[PDB]
Write an enzyme that holds these catalytic residues in place. Structure first.
Site, PDB file in Angstrom:
ATOM      1  N   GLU A   1       0.653  -1.284  -0.098  1.00  0.00           N
ATOM      2  CA  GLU A   1       0.007  -0.478   0.085  1.00  0.00           C
ATOM      3  C   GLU A   1       0.538   1.296  -0.541  1.00  0.00           C
ATOM      4  O   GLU A   1       0.801   2.100  -1.060  1.00  0.00           O
ATOM      5  CB  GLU A   1      -0.769  -0.090   1.248  1.00  0.00           C
ATOM      6  CG  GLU A   1      -1.787   1.408   1.020  1.00  0.00           C
ATOM      7  CD  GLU A   1      -2.309   0.992   2.850  1.00  0.00           C
ATOM      8  OE1 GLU A   1      -2.491   0.907   3.584  1.00  0.00           O
ATOM      9  OE2 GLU A   1      -3.755   1.659   2.536  1.00  0.00           O
TER      10      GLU A   1
ATOM     11  N   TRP B   1      -8.274  -1.503   0.186  1.00  0.00           N
ATOM     12  CA  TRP B   1      -9.076  -0.759  -0.167  1.00  0.00           C
ATOM     13  C   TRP B   1     -10.349  -1.614  -0.776  1.00  0.00           C
ATOM     14  O   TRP B   1     -10.734  -0.937  -1.825  1.00  0.00           O
ATOM     15  CB  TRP B   1      -8.364  -0.351  -1.050  1.00  0.00           C
ATOM     16  CG  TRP B   1      -7.853   0.545  -0.591  1.00  0.00           C
ATOM     17  CD1 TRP B   1      -6.066   0.473   0.296  1.00  0.00           C
ATOM     18  CD2 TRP B   1      -7.550   2.536   0.067  1.00  0.00           C
ATOM     19  NE1 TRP B   1      -5.466   1.587   0.561  1.00  0.00           N
ATOM     20  CE2 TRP B   1      -6.465   2.436   0.379  1.00  0.00           C
ATOM     21  CE3 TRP B   1      -8.916   3.007  -0.550  1.00  0.00           C
ATOM     22  CZ2 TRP B   1      -6.054   4.066   1.087  1.00  0.00           C
ATOM     23  CZ3 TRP B   1      -8.515   4.443   0.082  1.00  0.00           C
ATOM     24  CH2 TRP B   1      -7.443   5.008   0.896  1.00  0.00           C
TER      25      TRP B   1
ATOM     26  N   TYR C   1      -4.956   9.681  -0.582  1.00  0.00           N
ATOM     27  CA  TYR C   1      -2.911   9.331  -1.206  1.00  0.00           C
ATOM     28  C   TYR C   1      -2.147   8.961  -1.914  1.00  0.00           C
ATOM     29  O   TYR C   1      -1.624  10.876  -1.704  1.00  0.00           O
ATOM     30  CB  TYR C   1      -2.637   8.195  -0.029  1.00  0.00           C
ATOM     31  CG  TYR C   1      -3.914   8.373   1.109  1.00  0.00           C
ATOM     32  CD1 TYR C   1      -2.962   9.362   2.617  1.00  0.00           C
ATOM     33  CD2 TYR C   1      -4.622   7.586   1.994  1.00  0.00           C
ATOM     34  CE1 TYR C   1      -4.201   8.869   3.700  1.00  0.00           C
ATOM     35  CE2 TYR C   1      -5.177   6.877   3.305  1.00  0.00           C
ATOM     36  CZ  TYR C   1      -4.862   7.659   3.739  1.00  0.00           C
ATOM     37  OH  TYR C   1      -5.775   7.914   5.022  1.00  0.00           O
TER      38      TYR C   1
ATOM     39  N   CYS D   1      -7.469   9.274   6.732  1.00  0.00           N
ATOM     40  CA  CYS D   1      -8.133   8.891   7.988  1.00  0.00           C
ATOM     41  C   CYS D   1      -6.905   9.667   8.560  1.00  0.00           C
ATOM     42  O   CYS D   1      -6.079  10.412   9.757  1.00  0.00           O
ATOM     43  CB  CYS D   1      -7.967   7.463   8.548  1.00  0.00           C
ATOM     44  SG  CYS D   1      -9.502   6.690   8.253  1.00  0.00           S
TER      45      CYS D   1
ATOM     46  N   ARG E   1      -7.365  11.764  12.352  1.00  0.00           N
ATOM     47  CA  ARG E   1      -8.458  12.104  12.403  1.00  0.00           C
ATOM     48  C   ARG E   1      -9.287  10.866  12.847  1.00  0.00           C
ATOM     49  O   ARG E   1     -10.292  11.507  14.038  1.00  0.00           O
ATOM     50  CB  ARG E   1      -9.057  13.253  11.745  1.00  0.00           C
ATOM     51  CG  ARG E   1      -9.191  12.044  10.433  1.00  0.00           C
ATOM     52  CD  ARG E   1     -10.709  12.343   9.318  1.00  0.00           C
ATOM     53  NE  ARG E   1     -10.825  11.167   8.614  1.00  0.00           N
ATOM     54  CZ  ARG E   1     -11.849  10.705   7.946  1.00  0.00           C
ATOM     55  NH1 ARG E   1     -12.701  10.536   9.459  1.00  0.00           N
ATOM     56  NH2 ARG E   1     -12.588   9.974   7.557  1.00  0.00           N
TER      57      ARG E   1
ATOM     58  N   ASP F   1      -8.908   3.408  14.308  1.00  0.00           N
ATOM     59  CA  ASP F   1     -10.006   2.088  14.974  1.00  0.00           C
ATOM     60  C   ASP F   1      -8.660   1.564  16.118  1.00  0.00           C
ATOM     61  O   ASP F   1      -8.124   0.541  14.997  1.00  0.00           O
ATOM     62  CB  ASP F   1     -10.573   1.938  13.814  1.00  0.00           C
ATOM     63  CG  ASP F   1     -11.144  -0.010  13.444  1.00  0.00           C
ATOM     64  OD1 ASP F   1     -11.313   0.563  14.400  1.00  0.00           O
ATOM     65  OD2 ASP F   1     -11.333  -0.698  12.782  1.00  0.00           O
TER      66      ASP F   1
HETATM   67  O1  LIG Z   1      -5.290   2.730   7.962  1.00  0.00           O
HETATM   68  C1  LIG Z   1      -6.792   3.213   8.610  1.00  0.00           C
HETATM   69  C2  LIG Z   1      -8.115   3.430   7.898  1.00  0.00           C
HETATM   70  C3  LIG Z   1      -8.965   3.286   9.132  1.00  0.00           C
HETATM   71  N1  LIG Z   1      -8.917   3.561  10.214  1.00  0.00           N
HETATM   72  C4  LIG Z   1     -10.305   3.488   9.964  1.00  0.00           C
HETATM   73  C5  LIG Z   1     -11.027   4.744  11.000  1.00  0.00           C
HETATM   74  C6  LIG Z   1     -12.608   4.717  11.448  1.00  0.00           C
HETATM   75  O2  LIG Z   1     -13.179   3.241  11.765  1.00  0.00           O
HETATM   76  C7  LIG Z   1     -13.334   4.515   9.530  1.00  0.00           C
HETATM   77  C8  LIG Z   1     -13.484   5.907   8.774  1.00  0.00           C
HETATM   78  O3  LIG Z   1     -14.430   5.580   9.141  1.00  0.00           O
HETATM   79  P1  LIG Z   1     -14.617   7.393   8.838  1.00  0.00           P
HETATM   80  O4  LIG Z   1     -14.092   8.056  10.275  1.00  0.00           O
HETATM   81  O5  LIG Z   1     -13.837   8.088   8.020  1.00  0.00           O
HETATM   82  O6  LIG Z   1     -15.691   7.981   9.518  1.00  0.00           O
HETATM   83  O7  LIG Z   1     -11.574   3.039   9.181  1.00  0.00           O
HETATM   84  C9  LIG Z   1      -7.847   3.654  10.662  1.00  0.00           C
HETATM   85  O8  LIG Z   1      -8.217   3.362  12.034  1.00  0.00           O
HETATM   86  N2  LIG Z   1      -6.610   3.404   9.805  1.00  0.00           N
END
Ligand SMILES: O=c1ccn([C@H]2C[C@H](O)[C@@H](COP(=O)(O)O)O2)c(=O)[nH]1
Ligand SMILES: NC(=O)C1=CN([C@@H]2O[C@H](COP(=O)(O)OP(=O)(O)OC[C@H]3O[C@@H](n4cnc5c(N)ncnc54)[C@H](OP(=O)(O)O)[C@@H]3O)[C@@H](O)[C@H]2O)C=CC1
Ligand SMILES: NC(=O)C1=CN([C@@H]2O[C@H](COP(=O)(O)OP(=O)(O)OC[C@H]3O[C@@H](n4cnc5c(N)ncnc54)[C@H](OP(=O)(O)O)[C@@H]3O)[C@@H](O)[C@H]2O)C=CC1
Ligand SMILES: COc1ccc(OC)c(CNc2ccc3nc(N)nc(N)c3c2Cl)c1
Ligand SMILES: COc1ccc(OC)c(CNc2ccc3nc(N)nc(N)c3c2Cl)c1
Ligand SMILES: O=c1ccn([C@H]2C[C@H](O)[C@@H](COP(=O)(O)O)O2)c(=O)[nH]1
Lengths: 545, 542
Positions: free
Chosen positions: A321, A343, A369, A429, A449, A452
């Protein structure tokens, strides 16, 4: 009721173990348990050449004494023997073989009362100031006649074994050398019902290998500015007002630990804080989550590679990636054809349609990105277009600033292009990366921002750590700190059970990362230029169940 | 040898507010620890009710650590059945006793004692003791079982107990509001009593306050060694860095507990001076810098306007209103005498930025522009950009109102495409908002931070901005989180900051906005009011 020997005389054990050279049952997915670290020696000496940090810790520990604490230990011991009432030193006990394996110039071990176990040899055979004994019992009698702080068993396979069997060990200061070596002697297999790890140290690198220090403990089968401390906590809420319905036993182990200094706890402690004090909220999905706002984690890439060890993680994907980003790609097919599905879900006809991207080709992720890193500003057409020299090439820009204006406070890589957000499968993110350069070392901050904690973050930590190594190398610098800043940190409810299991696993010393040293340009990296070494980890965990 | 106050543990606990200047003496007010002295008025407390201090009062006076009473007993008789519960002795003047409600009388869990020349033991319980004079107290303390003795006193009681060097520690509550008073706590002699601890700042019954501690100046066991072991590789110090002398921070290092929010800022400075890296900079002045810090301010309990030095806010508020309008014209600010952006708009500075064709003070697509027209083509500060570009400010306000759980509520000023056209790249990269239970929090990432001059204003700017957004969204402000990237201290500020670090913070002030303003665009300089701002004197960093 009646005190045990090991407690009155304070008899501890200290050792250093590496990974044994088991040919293999297949380096192809091997199980890892605490028994993984058991290599004591080879051909009469240490399996490894030299690991100064372990030597330093070894000397530090076996020589430290607290004068003011002896008086209390004296009473303890005298009282035990029904007995009424030079610089204080500790006692070290070592088997003959072990003693003979130590270089003359170090014997007897300085500032310590040396004691040697042996039958074949007697006092007459030693020129040194050392006590000789031929019965473990003799050592006990001796301790009763000596003035000492603590007694450490410097070991020897044989010596270690009998001392543990006679249950004379109160604690085990265990150094985990995270590298493999040829060995012929091993440390006994510790019984977890007799001993449990109570502390885990920071992780370090010394002589080409990471290592940490853990402490096993025997298990049961001024004073005024202290009152003021109590006062200032007068408003701390009571109990049964924490935030969530989390049960005690859920983190029995995790909370048993006295010192949780291993870096992986920066992550684990965040999971815990969210589970204990998180806020109940619904989300873009429907699963619901526990969330907190604003965290920061720091990883010292000079001492280790922070690949979570409390569960198995693979890096081929996140590396492809990263390479994919660098090339400025936005074609989801490129990843799928390498069997990377990070993705996939965001490129389906359905997903795209839900984002009102009705005229976007399946897997055409848009100006995400890659595109923003190489062409920020350029009007996006489709994933197959040639965007050469269109838009700002941020990547090129930051690498030049690191090389020619290292003190710049403007070295940022931003993917959050307010203007293109909507045209993206989903907004990024990982908002940005700011770089810092000092004394030939590169540090990097990445603001996320949305995080997870259960599935994403572990991979995010890895991604940007690798990226730091990459930027650092092509810039002729050494990686320093990777600082991870979390905005909206959340734990998905359908993950709460797996994480409870994770927080009760003790971390292993982190592995390392080796990049092909020939690669001098951020663009010339390929999947085979990356190598993770000595990755000792727990069993894989399925978060979603 | 021995001193009475050390043996009998005689402490003093109180709460003082500010007293009206009585319309006499109208100049620029100066502050000092004596600012807080108001004790009572008309036999009652100067204030209606401050439950938090009440909670502190009770907790402190009733606390007892029995496992430590033996050592005290040892010390007491070595100087000189009936209580299944060890307690504390609370000495209070007659007036003070009378002023206490009857329902609470004979202060629960506290060996009551009263000083009077009128109260006759008879008409009182056997418990409630009474004495004829100061010196008589020591006698009752020798014939009793108590943990610590607290002087709830009264103005008279306090005064005397101090002149007679009987007080060991003073638990002073600083009420940050003004009231009319007739009796005041005596002025503490800095040569005899000094502050060793400062608490977190709180808001109770419409006022902020904190708890400080004055100390009389003198002019298990196994995981303990384990801790030491874990430090075996501790920086192998004993070698000064950045050439910073010991006593340069005497007062700062003398404090035991620094829980005041201001220390989040002060500690970062301390950290940079002690461990910062020496670096040259685009100005040739040199700095000490570190990378990555975070600060958190509970806007619901106070307004983080630094107190260890004077800070003015009219300028920064005007800049904020200037951002909200989306302006990029520096003349607007200079005409209000706000010269924050003056240096960045001079012919020289613009020319140095290679912006030879930019009018003086035409700052380019900076903050304002990015907040209301991100993506629009910047031509000149006088052009009409109405409805061009993306209005992020509007979008986040809608996202907050209609999608509070969104994790995409960000305001970004770092437009990569337009950076070079800006007089200078934004120091304040972005703002992220979070919403829960009707509360609003904000994270602002700053890429460059002049800890000495800028950060203090920065903290205030976005705190106010958080208040502004919350209000126009019908939410209450919560936390303001400041994330510092490159945090640096300019070498020519060091001496000034050495003076600052040794000053002890005052409780924070509060920010009051005009409740009628319901739209972000409707605020005006008069809709902001900073109340109860007690601060130290100004300091010129340069
Ligand atoms: O590298 C990554 C990509 C995605 N997410 C997570 C954050 C959120 O749980 C979800 C995207 O939802 P939004 O925050 O955009 O609403 O994917 C991560 O933690 N790390
Ligand atoms: N990695 C690490 O942290 C450590 C590694 N080592 C390594 O371990 C190896 C040595 O271990 P190993 O071979 O087990 O040897 P040991 O050091 O345990 O020595 C065994 C010998 O000690 C004596 N001994 C043990 N118990 C008794 C007893 N109860 N009464 C009398 N004598 C006793 C005997 O000496 P005798 O023959 O005279 O009768 C015996 O044969 C080396 O390679 C050394 O480098 C050692 C310590 C630590
Ligand atoms: N903010 C705070 O923390 C506090 C505020 N207050 C406020 O202060 C005001 C009361 O203060 P103040 O007038 O000083 O009253 P005090 O409560 O100090 O009472 C003074 C009285 O106590 C007695 N007394 C004083 N010294 C002695 C002595 N050496 N020996 C024997 N008796 C002695 C006398 O009683 P007698 O007349 O019998 O001789 C005297 O007039 C009130 O409005 C109350 O609300 C009070 C305590 C704390
Ligand atoms: C000064 O002591 C020495 C100098 C050189 C050595 O290498 C052969 C040795 C070997 N012994 C040795 C080396 C490292 C060790 N490390 C730990 N954590 N614990 C021990 N118990 C230990 C021991 Cl006994 C000792
Ligand atoms: C339950 O006890 C009370 C209820 C109400 C009171 O004031 C009317 C009082 C007495 N006044 C009172 C109130 C608050 C106080 N707070 C502090 N930090 N220190 C005191 N020394 C003190 C005192 Cl004497 C006690
Ligand atoms: O509100 C502000 C505005 C500016 N600065 C400082 C940060 C840097 O010291 C300088 C900008 O220069 P660069 O970092 O961009 O080089 O201004 C602040 O601390 N706060």
């Amino acid at each position: 009721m009646m005190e045990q020997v090991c407690d009155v005389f304070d008899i501890y054990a200290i050792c250093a173990c590496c990974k044994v050279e088991s040919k293999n049952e297949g380096k192809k997915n091997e199980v890892f348990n605490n028994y993984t670290f058991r290599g004591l020696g080879n051909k009469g000496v240490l399996p490894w050449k030299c690991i100064s940090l372990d030597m330093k810790y070894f000397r530090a520990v076996t020589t430290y004494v607290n004068e003011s604490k002896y008086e209390k230990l004296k009473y303890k011991r005298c009282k035990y023997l029904n007995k009424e009432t030079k610089k204080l030193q500790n006692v070290v006990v070592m088997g003959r073989t072990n003693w003979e394996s130590i270089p003359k110039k170090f014997k007897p071990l300085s500032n310590r009362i040396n004691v040697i176990l042996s039958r074949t040899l007697k006092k007459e055979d030693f020129d040194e100031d050392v006590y000789i004994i031929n019965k473990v019992e003799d050592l006990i009698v001796l301790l009763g006649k000596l003035n000492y702080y603590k007694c450490f068993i410097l070991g020897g396979s044989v010596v270690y074994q009998e001392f543990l069997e006679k249950k004379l060990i109160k604690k085990i200061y265990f150094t985990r050398i995270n590298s493999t070596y040829e060995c012929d002697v091993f440390f006994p297999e510790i019984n977890e019902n007799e001993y449990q790890i109570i502390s885990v140290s920071d992780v370090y690198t010394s002589n080409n290998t990471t290592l940490d220090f853990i402490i096993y403990k025997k298990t049961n089968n001024d004073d005024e500015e202290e009152d003021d401390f109590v006062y200032f906590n007068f408003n701390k809420e009571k109990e049964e007002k924490n935030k969530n319905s989390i049960h005690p036993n859920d983190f029995q182990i995790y909370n048993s630990l006295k010192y949780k200094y291993h870096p992986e706890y920066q992550y684990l402690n965040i999971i815990y804080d969210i589970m204990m004090n998180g806020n109940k909220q619904s989300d873009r999905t429907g699963v619901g989550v526990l969330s907190k706002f604003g965290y920061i984690m720091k990883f010292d890439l000079s001492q280790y590679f922070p690949l979570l060890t409390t569960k198995k993680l693979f890096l081929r994907g996140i590396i492809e990636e990263l390479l994919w980003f660098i090339r400025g790609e936005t074609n989801g097919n490129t990843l799928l054809n390498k069997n990377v599905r990070i993705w996939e879900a965001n490129g389906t006809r359905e997903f795209l349609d839900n984002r009102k991207l009705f005229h976007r080709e399946v897997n055409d992720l848009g100006p995400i990105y890659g595109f923003q890193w190489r062409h920020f500003g350029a009007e996006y057409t489709n994933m197959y277009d040639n965007y050469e020299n269109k838009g700002v090439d941020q990547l090129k820009n930051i690498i030049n600033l690191i090389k020619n204006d290292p003190t710049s406070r403007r070295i940022l890589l931003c993917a959050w292009n307010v203007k293109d957000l909507d045209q993206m499968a989903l907004p990024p993110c990982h908002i940005l990366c700011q770089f810092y350069v000092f004394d030939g070392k590169l540090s990097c901050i990445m603001y996320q921002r949305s995080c997870d904690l259960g599935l994403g973050v572990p991979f995010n930590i890895a991604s940007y750590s690798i990226f730091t190594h990459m930027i650092a190398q092509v810039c002729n610098l050494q990686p320093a700190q990777f600082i991870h800043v979390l905005g909206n940190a959340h734990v998905y409810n359908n993950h709460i059970d797996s994480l409870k299991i994770q927080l009760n696993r003790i971390p292993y010393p982190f592995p390392t990362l080796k990049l092909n040293p020939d690669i001098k340009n951020i663009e010339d990296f390929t999947i085979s230029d990356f190598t993770i070494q000595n990755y000792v980890h727990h069993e894989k965990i399925s978060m979603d169940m």
